[PDB]
Amino acid sequence: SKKCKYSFKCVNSLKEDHNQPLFGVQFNWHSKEGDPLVFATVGSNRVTLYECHSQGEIRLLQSYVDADADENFYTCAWTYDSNTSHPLLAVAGSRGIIRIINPITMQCIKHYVGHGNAINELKFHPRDPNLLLSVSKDHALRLWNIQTDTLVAIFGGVEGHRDEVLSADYDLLGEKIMSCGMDHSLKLWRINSKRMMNAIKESYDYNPNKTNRPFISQKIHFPDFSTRDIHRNYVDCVRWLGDLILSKSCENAIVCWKPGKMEDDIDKIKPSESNVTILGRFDYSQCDIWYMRFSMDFWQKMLALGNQVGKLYVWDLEVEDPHKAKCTTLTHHKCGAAIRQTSFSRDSSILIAVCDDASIWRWDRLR
Amino acid sequence: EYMRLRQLKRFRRADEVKSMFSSNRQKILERTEILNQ
Amino acid sequence: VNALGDKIFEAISSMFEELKEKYKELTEQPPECTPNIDGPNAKSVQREQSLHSFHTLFCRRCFKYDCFLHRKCNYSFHATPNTYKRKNTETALDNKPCGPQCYQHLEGAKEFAAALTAER
Amino acid sequence: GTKTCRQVYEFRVKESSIIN
Amino acid sequence: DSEDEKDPEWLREKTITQIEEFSDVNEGEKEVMKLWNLHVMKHGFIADNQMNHACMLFVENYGQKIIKKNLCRNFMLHLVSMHDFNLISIMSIDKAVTKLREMQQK
Ligand SMILES: [Zn+2]
């Protein structure tokens, strides 16, 4: 009966001019301590940057647009060029075009085109900032080495997805990749294999001028695990809760499950493991419309998911049996749109929800 | 009988999920600590 | 059923599934039988059982074991393992025996072998 | 392997009898 | 680099997985079956007569692997089964076995 642990209040509410629905938001978790909390937003043909200040003073630091085509950005992902420590924002969607924007120079540093449909999610390898994972609608998930502009591996094939790969997530240590698709399946590709080390090292040590042969991208046709009995529908977003798995479907709930039986170690799981045991389901209301990813803070203390009506749920994961408890529902009479995505700052003090009415919302923890 | 067996199974499942959650939380603590470092 | 209180009457009486569950519980309480002959654990079986795996899982059309192009659901009677393609049973016995020990070296072994083969 | 030719003949003899 | 060759890596992995996914098969027999399938896919034999030479090529490429795996008896069992399926011959079996023995002596 505990009323959760975190209480939030709405301190600001922005609105993009383009008025088209904005889909993704990503705080720059690579900013140093004391650096102003910069977060990015993607929606329609425009990607906008903002800087969070005291009392909700959100400053529109930068803004970009791709008006030469009909690009509709779907997701954003933050990284940094380790050579110069410049923060880098990776954006994609609709066109399947990956743009690595450099907010320092306000220029699109790199462009990547190998995907055959809209890219629905971009994530970066937690250990390696140059490894960008793109889950697209072409039934494939690719791994790019943006440091050398190479395709490290393609994670689709004979045993890959049979529909759009809606979202994907890295392990906390960045070793196993979980991908949720529109084919109701959640295949667990493993970047821990010696093949993955070989591919990553070769991509890092690949010079196009040295050899005429192209880079031999690895084709991981067979996932190290796969299941279809978790969700009766497609899986929008997936997230690694340490060694557990969090996934969400059209069933108005996010279930926490684990590959194998209850005593089956994730690392020591055979690819043919046909058993999956679920642990608990976080039950919310009115989230039937698809493609509303959730997010958890860096410490994974808590996670938050948006809603189609306008509510915002956040659950505390420190509480014993997190499937229990009643969460904290953040509401506002002026928030009637559908929250496409949420994001937490590196310190989980600012929770920002981007709605489907191009209206950004900022929430701060009362503490 | 059947009720006792069901209660025992439910209790065992509850302790199992609690222990799994605690172990996953410890792993999360270690991994987040090294990531922050 | 195990906790209570041999596996049908008492179980059906207590539970009432019910009678069907009790009957099922009462009933309840390599697979090829061809161990690898290269490995130490290896028994002795006839050639129809020591080669059944090779015969069943080979495609004569593509010369590959369990080929993808041609699929058989084992509907036929073991797909006629190797059929009778060894029709060329004609062979010639030659002189110059194996060496110090040979059937041809031993007197009468050849005739005994011929008589045994001539059982018909 | 091993199984001299005389031994092979003896084995064959032993295997005889017994059983649009 | 026409980038389209006879045996794609995914096909080889699928063949290995399918062979190892059988229940009624010995371990060494599965190993020799997988080796033969990989050899056939790598060389793409389509002719019965070539199959004869194929067997020799096997001991020219997988002889050391079979000797190390110590599945020579399973290999000769496979040769006998192939002879039963027609193609190859008694002379072919003898030549292949002798070449395999020469590999061990080497
Ligand atoms: Zn075939």
XYZ file of C-alpha atoms and ligand atoms in Angstrom:
651
model
C 0.000 0.000 0.000
C 3.091 2.204 -0.152
C 2.544 5.294 -2.304
C 5.779 4.713 -4.255
C 8.864 6.819 -3.507
C 9.198 9.568 -6.158
C 6.840 12.528 -6.526
C 7.051 14.792 -9.570
C 5.566 18.185 -10.405
C 5.164 19.812 -13.811
C 7.407 22.886 -13.966
C 7.427 23.604 -17.705
C 5.583 22.775 -20.913
C 6.956 23.661 -24.350
C 5.426 23.393 -27.832
C 7.218 22.938 -31.153
C 6.134 25.179 -34.019
C 5.833 22.390 -36.601
C 2.833 21.020 -34.646
C 3.463 17.577 -36.052
C 3.783 14.750 -33.502
C 7.234 14.453 -31.944
C 8.328 10.875 -31.360
C 11.588 10.628 -29.404
C 13.422 12.371 -26.577
C 16.898 11.570 -25.249
C 18.781 13.249 -22.429
C 22.525 13.610 -22.965
C 23.683 11.156 -20.310
C 27.303 11.677 -21.409
C 27.402 15.240 -20.058
C 29.813 15.767 -17.176
C 28.758 16.683 -13.649
C 27.490 20.257 -13.475
C 27.151 20.560 -17.246
C 23.680 21.880 -18.162
C 21.262 19.043 -18.880
C 20.920 19.023 -22.670
C 18.212 16.853 -24.220
C 17.139 16.380 -27.827
C 13.729 16.007 -29.455
C 12.782 14.493 -32.815
C 9.511 15.031 -34.659
C 8.365 15.621 -38.234
C 11.288 16.846 -40.349
C 12.858 18.849 -37.500
C 15.181 17.815 -34.673
C 15.362 20.310 -31.810
C 17.811 20.627 -28.919
C 17.003 22.119 -25.527
C 18.863 22.976 -22.333
C 17.198 22.505 -18.947
C 17.632 25.156 -16.245
C 16.240 25.953 -12.811
C 12.497 26.525 -12.342
C 11.755 24.836 -15.669
C 13.521 27.441 -17.825
C 13.986 25.270 -20.903
C 16.220 27.087 -23.396
C 15.984 26.122 -27.064
C 19.713 25.782 -27.708
C 19.614 24.504 -31.293
C 17.295 23.280 -34.027
C 17.735 21.434 -37.322
C 15.545 20.443 -40.261
C 15.777 18.290 -43.395
C 13.472 20.055 -45.851
C 15.107 18.617 -48.982
C 13.109 15.397 -48.488
C 10.052 14.128 -46.593
C 12.036 12.758 -43.645
C 9.998 12.075 -40.495
C 12.468 11.555 -37.657
C 11.430 8.757 -35.304
C 14.188 8.397 -32.703
C 17.270 10.080 -31.266
C 20.383 8.744 -29.566
C 23.229 10.543 -27.812
C 26.924 9.710 -28.067
C 30.267 11.502 -28.058
C 33.311 11.641 -30.320
C 35.990 10.275 -27.992
C 38.655 12.016 -30.091
C 37.288 15.485 -29.258
C 34.656 14.805 -26.534
C 32.047 16.604 -28.652
C 28.524 15.316 -27.927
C 26.934 13.660 -30.950
C 23.253 13.087 -31.703
C 22.178 10.236 -33.986
C 18.784 10.611 -35.661
C 16.827 8.480 -38.121
C 13.320 7.567 -39.191
C 10.947 7.305 -42.154
C 13.720 7.561 -44.751
C 15.986 5.052 -43.027
C 18.756 7.671 -43.012
C 21.110 7.789 -40.025
C 22.474 11.287 -39.378
C 25.152 11.844 -36.729
C 24.599 15.526 -35.961
C 27.351 17.469 -34.190
C 25.720 20.208 -32.067
C 29.127 21.820 -31.493
C 29.509 22.631 -35.201
C 25.741 22.472 -35.938
C 26.462 20.232 -38.945
C 25.506 16.683 -39.909
C 28.872 14.999 -39.373
C 28.046 11.608 -40.897
C 25.272 9.999 -42.935
C 24.516 6.270 -43.081
C 22.211 4.584 -45.603
C 21.942 0.811 -45.761
C 18.480 0.229 -44.348
C 15.511 -0.660 -46.516
C 12.728 1.011 -44.508
C 12.028 3.362 -41.607
C 14.401 3.104 -38.646
C 12.376 2.859 -35.443
C 15.049 2.946 -32.726
C 18.682 3.923 -32.246
C 20.771 2.789 -29.287
C 24.476 3.081 -28.547
C 26.738 0.430 -27.058
C 27.227 1.311 -23.361
C 30.941 0.481 -23.428
C 31.738 1.545 -27.003
C 30.374 4.982 -28.004
C 31.041 4.339 -31.715
C 28.748 1.287 -32.019
C 25.285 2.432 -33.115
C 22.455 -0.108 -33.234
C 19.591 0.614 -35.635
C 16.346 -1.380 -35.611
C 14.464 -0.732 -38.850
C 11.277 -1.846 -40.594
C 13.271 -3.967 -43.075
C 13.201 -6.955 -40.668
C 16.845 -6.308 -39.748
C 18.873 -4.694 -36.963
C 22.245 -3.326 -38.045
C 25.384 -2.439 -36.092
C 27.361 0.535 -37.396
C 30.867 1.558 -36.343
C 30.479 5.308 -36.768
C 34.170 5.796 -35.949
C 35.167 4.120 -39.231
C 31.797 4.386 -41.054
C 31.434 0.617 -41.431
C 28.595 -1.869 -41.028
C 29.764 -4.121 -38.197
C 26.974 -6.687 -38.472
C 23.427 -7.264 -39.695
C 21.152 -9.037 -37.213
C 18.523 -10.343 -39.616
C 18.273 -13.360 -41.856
C 16.973 -16.925 -41.961
C 16.038 -17.019 -38.266
C 15.762 -13.248 -37.839
C 12.611 -11.164 -37.586
C 9.677 -11.685 -39.945
C 8.377 -8.121 -39.487
C 9.507 -4.682 -38.338
C 12.048 -4.573 -35.508
C 10.295 -1.926 -33.427
C 12.888 -1.464 -30.678
C 16.040 -2.927 -29.178
C 18.064 -2.601 -25.993
C 21.581 -3.331 -24.791
C 22.538 -5.166 -21.640
C 23.684 -3.020 -18.728
C 27.276 -4.113 -19.352
C 26.638 -4.040 -23.110
C 26.986 -7.715 -23.986
C 23.586 -9.031 -25.138
C 21.158 -7.237 -27.461
C 17.412 -7.770 -27.077
C 15.233 -6.756 -30.028
C 11.448 -6.436 -29.959
C 9.697 -6.770 -33.301
C 6.307 -6.499 -34.952
C 6.381 -10.279 -35.514
C 5.510 -10.822 -31.806
C 9.070 -12.098 -31.250
C 11.870 -10.958 -28.929
C 15.123 -12.445 -30.223
C 18.224 -12.124 -28.024
C 21.245 -11.493 -30.209
C 24.539 -11.891 -28.369
C 27.431 -9.488 -28.905
C 29.443 -11.563 -26.395
C 30.544 -14.148 -28.970
C 34.140 -14.231 -30.175
C 32.623 -13.593 -33.604
C 31.373 -10.249 -32.283
C 34.842 -9.318 -30.998
C 36.332 -10.303 -34.354
C 33.768 -8.196 -36.223
C 34.198 -5.148 -33.982
C 38.003 -5.319 -34.087
C 38.008 -5.739 -37.873
C 35.639 -2.787 -38.285
C 37.861 -0.641 -36.067
C 40.894 -1.833 -38.069
C 39.360 -1.358 -41.536
C 40.792 1.208 -43.956
C 38.978 1.537 -47.314
C 42.073 2.881 -49.085
C 44.227 -0.050 -47.934
C 42.258 -2.780 -49.728
C 39.895 -2.953 -52.686
C 37.670 -5.551 -51.007
C 34.759 -4.120 -48.991
C 34.342 -4.671 -45.280
C 32.916 -8.132 -44.614
C 29.871 -7.349 -42.489
C 28.864 -10.231 -40.245
C 25.447 -11.721 -41.012
C 24.080 -13.050 -37.706
C 21.229 -15.054 -39.192
C 20.511 -17.001 -35.989
C 19.692 -15.283 -32.677
C 21.087 -16.784 -29.494
C 17.505 -16.888 -28.155
C 14.011 -16.250 -29.477
C 10.471 -16.391 -28.114
C 6.923 -15.601 -29.203
C 4.838 -16.662 -26.173
C 5.413 -13.561 -24.024
C 3.048 -11.168 -25.819
C -0.114 -12.091 -27.703
C 0.609 -9.074 -29.941
C 3.682 -7.269 -31.242
C 6.250 -5.872 -28.806
C 6.812 -2.119 -29.044
C 9.750 -1.549 -26.682
C 12.146 -3.840 -24.834
C 14.614 -2.988 -22.082
C 17.279 -4.879 -20.141
C 16.659 -4.826 -16.384
C 20.065 -6.257 -15.582
C 19.634 -9.935 -16.411
C 15.832 -9.685 -16.616
C 13.787 -8.404 -19.565
C 11.074 -5.740 -19.712
C 8.801 -5.668 -22.758
C 5.569 -3.888 -23.645
C 2.742 -4.754 -26.034
C -0.804 -3.654 -26.905
C -2.023 -5.521 -23.799
C -1.959 -2.412 -21.552
C 0.907 -3.848 -19.504
C 4.695 -4.152 -19.424
C 5.757 -7.634 -18.342
C 9.031 -8.543 -16.638
C 10.223 -11.955 -17.804
C 13.423 -13.949 -18.068
C 14.701 -16.465 -20.647
C 14.700 -20.078 -19.540
C 13.248 -21.411 -16.327
C 13.503 -19.572 -13.011
C 16.971 -21.008 -12.266
C 18.340 -20.665 -15.821
C 21.325 -18.332 -16.096
C 21.031 -15.858 -18.965
C 24.670 -16.269 -20.007
C 24.481 -20.084 -19.939
C 21.378 -20.433 -22.115
C 21.363 -22.566 -25.246
C 19.965 -21.041 -28.463
C 17.316 -23.789 -28.565
C 15.865 -22.865 -25.146
C 12.094 -22.916 -25.707
C 11.117 -22.010 -22.123
C 10.425 -18.528 -20.759
C 9.268 -17.719 -17.221
C 7.638 -14.358 -16.531
C 8.101 -12.658 -13.161
C 5.636 -9.764 -13.070
C 3.631 -7.323 -15.152
C 3.406 -3.565 -14.621
C -0.258 -2.806 -15.314
C -1.244 0.599 -16.704
C -4.295 1.862 -18.593
C -5.015 3.279 -22.058
C -1.802 2.611 -23.977
C -3.281 0.647 -26.878
C -1.783 2.733 -29.696
C 1.582 1.259 -30.624
C 5.078 2.794 -30.655
C 5.153 4.433 -27.221
C 8.512 3.376 -25.805
C 9.217 3.649 -22.082
C 12.438 4.606 -20.336
C 14.332 3.955 -17.115
C 16.968 6.092 -15.443
C 20.677 5.339 -15.710
C 20.736 3.675 -12.282
C 17.546 1.759 -13.222
C 16.032 2.836 -9.906
C 12.754 3.627 -11.674
C 11.149 3.484 -15.109
C 8.430 5.615 -16.691
C 6.002 5.012 -19.554
C 3.700 7.447 -21.324
C 0.046 7.076 -22.196
C -2.283 7.800 -25.088
C -4.696 9.788 -22.903
C -1.983 11.979 -21.391
C -1.110 10.378 -18.067
C 2.451 9.433 -17.120
C 3.235 6.382 -14.985
C 6.501 5.785 -13.132
C 7.330 2.653 -11.115
C 9.991 2.275 -8.429
C 12.206 -0.741 -9.103
C 14.022 -0.758 -5.746
C 10.832 -1.870 -3.985
C 10.740 -5.588 -3.244
C 8.545 -7.365 -5.801
C 8.327 -4.380 -8.190
C 5.339 -6.021 -9.900
C 3.459 -4.903 -6.771
C 2.889 -1.289 -5.622
C 0.776 1.396 -7.306
C 3.414 3.584 -9.032
C 3.165 7.373 -9.363
C 0.804 8.762 -12.008
C 1.694 12.275 -13.175
C -1.170 14.157 -14.822
C -1.936 17.648 -16.095
C -5.176 19.177 -17.349
C -3.244 20.675 -20.286
C -1.700 17.297 -21.250
C -4.266 15.508 -23.394
C -1.990 14.281 -26.175
C -0.219 10.906 -26.369
C 3.246 10.735 -24.805
C 5.364 9.108 -27.507
C 8.470 8.785 -25.331
C 9.986 9.805 -22.007
C 13.532 10.338 -20.784
C 15.384 10.688 -17.484
C 18.433 12.823 -16.830
C 21.608 11.069 -15.706
C 20.546 11.957 -12.186
C 16.880 10.998 -12.161
C 15.714 14.499 -11.211
C 14.101 15.670 -14.474
C 11.543 13.480 -16.253
C 10.643 14.837 -19.694
C 7.714 13.472 -21.700
C 7.205 14.309 -25.378
C 3.573 14.231 -26.466
C 1.935 13.623 -29.849
C 0.872 17.290 -30.061
C 4.501 18.486 -30.380
C 4.281 19.618 -26.736
C 7.285 18.841 -24.543
C 6.625 18.423 -20.820
C 9.190 18.737 -18.029
C 8.708 17.088 -14.636
C 11.002 17.534 -11.636
C 11.229 15.246 -8.620
C 9.880 16.927 -5.492
C 12.150 14.773 -3.287
C -4.396 -31.444 -0.385
C -4.821 -29.584 -3.673
C -5.249 -26.270 -1.845
C -2.154 -26.939 0.275
C -0.123 -27.883 -2.806
C -1.264 -24.743 -4.637
C -0.413 -22.563 -1.631
C 3.029 -24.159 -1.306
C 3.711 -23.678 -5.023
C 2.585 -20.040 -4.884
C 4.755 -19.352 -1.831
C 7.758 -21.023 -3.472
C 7.214 -18.954 -6.620
C 6.991 -15.782 -4.523
C 10.271 -16.512 -2.738
C 11.880 -17.475 -6.052
C 10.875 -14.226 -7.760
C 11.953 -12.220 -4.703
C 15.380 -13.889 -4.701
C 15.725 -13.413 -8.461
C 14.813 -9.740 -8.083
C 17.379 -9.263 -5.311
C 20.133 -10.993 -7.302
C 19.286 -8.948 -10.398
C 19.349 -5.813 -8.242
C 22.819 -6.693 -6.953
C 24.011 -7.288 -10.521
C 22.451 -3.968 -11.564
C 24.215 -2.219 -8.685
C 27.597 -3.641 -9.694
C 27.118 -2.930 -13.405
C 25.836 0.615 -12.874
C 28.717 1.264 -10.466
C 31.346 0.190 -12.992
C 29.539 2.080 -15.770
C 29.485 5.275 -13.693
C 33.151 4.799 -12.785
C -1.988 -37.446 -4.677
C 1.447 -38.321 -3.283
C 0.874 -36.063 -0.267
C -2.412 -37.788 0.581
C -1.919 -40.986 2.560
C -2.891 -47.109 -4.686
C -2.885 -44.387 -7.347
C -6.413 -44.685 -8.789
C -9.087 -45.421 -6.186
C -7.821 -43.078 -3.464
C -6.934 -40.333 -5.952
C -10.327 -40.522 -7.678
C -12.133 -40.534 -4.325
C -10.204 -37.532 -2.989
C -10.148 -35.381 -6.138
C -13.777 -35.933 -7.167
C -9.953 -35.008 -14.209
C -11.203 -36.898 -11.137
C -11.434 -40.489 -12.374
C -9.575 -39.595 -15.578
C -6.876 -37.825 -13.557
C -6.512 -40.838 -11.254
C -6.257 -43.212 -14.221
C -3.661 -40.991 -15.907
C -1.632 -40.789 -12.688
C -1.766 -44.575 -12.302
C -0.650 -45.040 -15.915
C 2.204 -42.536 -15.547
C 3.642 -44.273 -12.472
C 20.949 -42.579 -28.006
C 17.254 -43.313 -28.646
C 18.305 -44.886 -31.965
C 19.921 -47.710 -29.928
C 23.025 -47.319 -32.132
C 25.886 -45.962 -30.007
C 28.833 -44.468 -31.871
C 30.946 -47.459 -32.903
C 34.041 -45.206 -32.928
C 33.401 -44.514 -29.206
C 34.247 -47.162 -26.540
C 30.542 -47.703 -25.648
C 29.437 -49.646 -28.748
C 27.316 -52.799 -28.779
C 26.832 -55.261 -31.648
C 23.835 -54.965 -33.982
C 22.894 -56.157 -37.449
C 23.740 -54.044 -40.485
C 20.069 -53.094 -40.923
C 20.300 -51.374 -37.519
C 23.955 -50.272 -37.635
C 23.291 -48.355 -40.879
C 19.626 -47.348 -40.533
C 20.544 -43.789 -39.544
C 22.761 -43.368 -42.612
C 20.119 -44.834 -44.931
C 17.195 -42.810 -43.579
C 19.029 -39.458 -43.439
C 20.646 -39.528 -46.902
C 19.324 -38.134 -50.188
C 20.609 -40.024 -53.226
C 19.605 -37.153 -55.527
C 21.799 -34.433 -53.988
C 24.441 -36.531 -52.138
C 23.860 -34.693 -48.862
C 22.602 -35.971 -45.522
C 19.167 -34.507 -44.720
C 19.113 -32.286 -47.788
C 16.977 -29.151 -47.898
C 15.859 -29.532 -51.524
C 14.146 -32.906 -51.024
C 12.069 -33.580 -47.912
C 10.556 -36.902 -46.859
C 8.112 -37.126 -43.950
C 8.926 -40.840 -43.431
C 5.534 -41.722 -44.936
C 7.029 -44.646 -46.860
C 8.287 -47.791 -45.111
C 11.653 -46.332 -44.054
C 12.047 -45.087 -47.660
C 13.509 -48.516 -48.557
C 16.850 -48.081 -46.715
C 19.480 -48.236 -49.481
C 16.804 -50.254 -51.337
C 18.597 -53.090 -53.145
C 21.036 -50.979 -55.157
C 23.827 -53.467 -54.339
C 22.642 -55.611 -57.236
C 26.206 -56.073 -58.549
C 26.829 -59.034 -56.257
C 29.182 -60.661 -58.777
C 32.714 -60.996 -57.420
C 35.830 -63.026 -58.186
C 37.927 -64.910 -55.642
C 41.647 -64.584 -56.326
C 44.779 -66.468 -55.306
C 47.709 -64.956 -53.366
C 46.086 -65.009 -49.902
C 46.318 -62.177 -47.401
C 49.532 -63.517 -45.881
C 50.507 -65.650 -42.890
C 46.858 -65.960 -41.786
C 44.021 -66.182 -44.305
C 40.872 -68.159 -45.013
C 42.404 -69.212 -48.335
C 45.523 -70.346 -46.459
C 43.465 -72.645 -44.217
C 42.378 -75.830 -45.977
C 38.644 -76.224 -46.541
C 37.654 -72.734 -45.382
C 36.757 -71.608 -48.913
C 34.402 -74.545 -49.476
C 32.805 -74.061 -46.054
C 32.213 -70.374 -46.803
C 30.731 -71.231 -50.201
C 28.397 -73.797 -48.627
C 27.317 -71.316 -45.946
C 26.595 -68.660 -48.577
C 24.713 -71.266 -50.642
C 21.985 -71.696 -48.006
C 19.533 -70.026 -50.441
C 41.583 -52.991 -37.269
C 43.690 -55.984 -36.177
C 41.260 -58.891 -36.874
C 43.528 -61.177 -38.899
C 42.080 -62.875 -41.981
C 42.080 -66.266 -40.260
C 40.345 -64.583 -37.322
C 37.861 -63.058 -39.779
C 37.107 -66.496 -41.234
C 36.703 -67.957 -37.742
C 34.332 -65.113 -36.840
C 32.300 -65.769 -39.990
C 32.122 -69.479 -39.139
C 31.059 -68.729 -35.557
C 28.394 -66.268 -36.724
C 26.963 -69.060 -38.878
C 24.173 -71.215 -37.425
C 23.083 -70.166 -33.899
C 20.426 -67.827 -35.303
C -0.110 -26.754 -68.013
C 33.921 -10.535 -55.817
C 30.592 -11.464 -57.373
C 29.578 -11.964 -53.697
C 27.214 -14.852 -54.586
C 28.856 -18.250 -54.034
C 27.589 -21.802 -53.784
C 27.429 -22.316 -49.995
C 26.392 -19.288 -47.919
C 27.475 -19.280 -44.289
C 23.865 -19.274 -43.095
C 23.162 -22.436 -45.098
C 26.184 -24.174 -43.561
C 25.149 -23.140 -40.052
C 21.570 -24.282 -40.681
C 22.774 -27.653 -41.981
C 25.005 -28.126 -38.930
C 22.166 -27.151 -36.585
C 19.665 -29.434 -38.332
C 22.055 -32.393 -38.210
C 22.910 -31.775 -34.547
C 19.195 -31.329 -33.752
C 18.388 -34.992 -34.413
C 17.530 -37.307 -31.533
C 18.214 -40.729 -33.097
C 21.855 -40.312 -34.112
C 25.266 -40.981 -32.595
C 27.617 -38.112 -31.782
C 30.427 -39.232 -34.081
C 27.887 -40.163 -36.744
C 26.421 -36.661 -36.502
C 29.930 -35.219 -36.786
C 30.730 -37.227 -39.917
C 27.340 -36.379 -41.448
C 27.912 -32.667 -40.835
C 31.431 -32.879 -42.270
C 30.167 -34.644 -45.397
C 27.367 -32.109 -45.863
C 29.778 -29.193 -45.463
C 32.178 -30.778 -47.961
C 29.393 -31.368 -50.496
C 28.097 -27.805 -50.158
C 31.623 -26.391 -50.443
C 32.219 -28.339 -53.665
C 28.649 -28.584 -54.987
C 28.721 -32.089 -56.449
C 25.811 -32.806 -58.795
C 27.236 -35.759 -60.735
C 27.183 -39.366 -59.539
C 30.594 -40.210 -61.008
C 32.158 -37.142 -59.386
C 30.801 -38.517 -56.098
C 33.489 -41.199 -56.351
C 36.225 -38.573 -56.558
C 34.286 -36.632 -53.920
C 35.085 -39.328 -51.367
C 38.797 -38.966 -52.091
C 38.495 -35.187 -51.805
C 36.916 -35.783 -48.400
C 40.041 -37.478 -47.072
C 42.048 -34.742 -48.794
C 40.261 -32.081 -46.737
C 38.653 -33.743 -43.699
C 41.017 -36.676 -43.158
C 43.007 -34.907 -40.452
C 39.804 -33.649 -38.822
C 38.296 -37.149 -38.783
C 41.525 -38.654 -37.424
C 41.683 -36.066 -34.633
C 37.977 -36.593 -33.904
C 38.662 -40.371 -34.036
C 35.511 -41.057 -36.074
C 37.258 -43.206 -38.696
C 34.909 -46.139 -38.084
C 31.909 -43.860 -38.632
C 33.552 -42.520 -41.799
C 34.008 -46.021 -43.210
C 30.429 -46.818 -42.199
C 29.374 -43.776 -44.236
C 31.444 -45.046 -47.170
C 29.707 -48.429 -46.911
C 26.305 -46.721 -46.851
C 27.255 -44.666 -49.911
C 28.328 -47.821 -51.750
C 24.959 -49.313 -50.798
C 23.306 -46.215 -52.320
C 25.311 -46.842 -55.522
C 28.097 -44.455 -56.573
C 31.611 -45.028 -55.198
C 32.895 -48.608 -55.314
C 34.833 -51.265 -53.435
C 38.009 -49.964 -55.074
C 36.980 -46.431 -54.094
C 36.335 -47.537 -50.503
C 39.723 -49.258 -50.314
C 41.543 -46.258 -51.796
C 39.799 -43.817 -49.447
C 40.551 -45.955 -46.389
C 44.198 -46.406 -47.393
C 44.553 -42.650 -47.899
C 42.979 -42.155 -44.468
C 45.426 -44.643 -42.937
C 48.330 -42.850 -44.622
C 47.185 -39.624 -42.951
C 47.440 -41.247 -39.514
C 50.893 -42.636 -40.317
C 51.912 -39.171 -41.503
Zn 18.816 -33.869 -51.793
